[PDB]
Amino acid sequence: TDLLTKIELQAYNHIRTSETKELQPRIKLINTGNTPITLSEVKIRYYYTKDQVINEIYTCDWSNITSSKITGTVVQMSNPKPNADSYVEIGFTNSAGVLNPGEYVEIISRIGNSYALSLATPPYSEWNYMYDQNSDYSFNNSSSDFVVWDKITVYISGTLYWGIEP
């Protein structure tokens, strides 16, 4: 048909140190087509290797649509690839609404051991909260602000609409 569904995904890592106690992917999903997209149908995946980190949780610190409309889950991959044995899957609630052409959602996230994300000393050996980021498929070690980024994937109703799987 003659109304195109199209998106662009921009992202960067807000912490780019080789080791981190929190993954900080920041993502901007933009509707660049001319069809509205129902947000609850959209899933975004940030792929990484969990290394020896435990108690992994997701939190959304902020979104331009507010964090209560955002969902995030940490998923272990049944079929791991090099640099990808886990992904953070970010989604939207049933009542998140519609992303019209020209609109965007921005999502600021933190992922890590629940005890590290509280900014208190985790009661663990370092390896149980410190990630290695260069072993993470979706990690961008350089950009200090949003860039178009092909290594985070986006699905609408289960179909891949953006990005390259690991």
In the complex, which residues of this chain contact Ca ion (CB under 5 A)?
A: 49, 51, 132, 135-136
Which is closer to Ca ion, CB of 41 or CB of 51?
51
Q: How many CA atoms lie within 13 A of 73 on its CB side?
A: 9
Nearest to 136 by CA among 3, 6, 25: 25
Give the 3-state secondary structure of residue 95. coil
Span of 25-33, 36-44, 74-82, 117-125 interacting with Zn ion by CB under 5 A:
74-82
CA-to-CA distance for 149 and 164, rounded, in angstroms? 10
* 20 phi, psi to nearest 5 deg: -145, 155
Which is closer to Ca ion, CB of 51 or CB of 61?
51
Cβ at position 93, least distance to Ca ion in Å: 29
Cβ at position 68, least distance to Zn ion in Å: 23
Q: Binding to Zn ion (CB under 5 A): which residues in 3-22? A: 19
CA-to-CA distance for 88 and 154, rounded, in angstroms? 12
Binding-site sequence positions for Ca(2+) = 49, 51, 132, 135-136
